[PDB]
Specification:
heterotetramer; A: about 60 residues; mainly beta; five-stranded antiparallel beta sheet; signaling protein; SH3 domain-complex; mona/gads SH3C domain; tetrameric
């Protein structure tokens, strides 16, 4: 459905439109069009997160 | 690493 | 870019963005034909594409 | 019309 991406570092959300996560979580990448900030889904919510904090899972 | 929020959509 | 709500939409899940008719949502992704990703009140969520505009 | 959640990403 969506690509998934592995969190490489912890990311602390500081606004409601951010998607915080812990290194190791696997984020559903709804929108990877922006080069700086992707839109993810994790813990049933949507949010922006730094595209360079994750790696695509290829399998 | 390094975070700059000004480029958020 | 921005879009005007045509209809009220009640969010029934945490990944949905609810809104009232006439509110003007920011559209972060219009690439999906059915369900767009919006921001309102500084929260993101999915909502039915056909329930809104666009202006930007 | 009809809101179909089956097409949500």
């Amino acid at each position: 459905g969506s690509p998934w991406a592995r969190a490489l570092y912890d990311f602390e959300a500081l606004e409601e439109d951010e998607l915080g996560f812990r290194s190791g979580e696997v984020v559903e990448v709804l929108d990877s069009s922006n080069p700086s900030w992707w839109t993810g889904r994790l813990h049933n919510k949507l949010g922006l997160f730094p595209a360079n904090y994750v790696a695509p899972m290829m399998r | 690493p390094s975070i700059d929020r000004s480029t958020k959509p």
